[PDB]
Amino acid sequence: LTPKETCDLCQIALRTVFGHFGGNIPSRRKLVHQLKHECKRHFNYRRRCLLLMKVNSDLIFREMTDGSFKPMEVCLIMRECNPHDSPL
């Protein structure tokens, strides 16, 4: 994966799962079951995605449930996006 792809993928994944719950996220355990499912939709990204959500599910949960949600921002904090890259 390019650093671009890797950034884009972070965003696509978090946005898709956030849209899935329509912003009403029930619990971290549940959030995680979907983050994992969503990781497996991407052949080349599965392995990295899965470890990313594992380590950072608390940060993703917090940011998602605050109402802010901007995917590109949480991906910057995880350093899967750098200030260089762009949103979607």
For the chain, domain boundaries: 1-88
Residue 46 and residue 35 in contact, taking contact as beta carbons nearer than 8 Å: no
Residue with tokens 């200030």: 83
Structure tokens at 50: 């899965």
d(CA 87, CA 14): 12
d(CA 83, CA 63): 19
| Structure's resolution in angstroms | 2.7
Residue 81 and residue 7 in contact, taking contact as beta carbons nearer than 8 Å: yes
Q: What is the largest CA-CA distance in the chain?
A: 33
The DSSP string of the chain is --HHHHHHHHHHHHHHHHHHTTT----HHHHHHHHHHHHTT-TTTHHHHHHHHHHHHHHHHHHHHTS---HHHHHHHTTSS-TTS---
Integer angstrom CA distances of residue 51 from 66, 87, 88: 23, 22, 23
| CATH code linked to domain 1-88 | 1.10.225.10
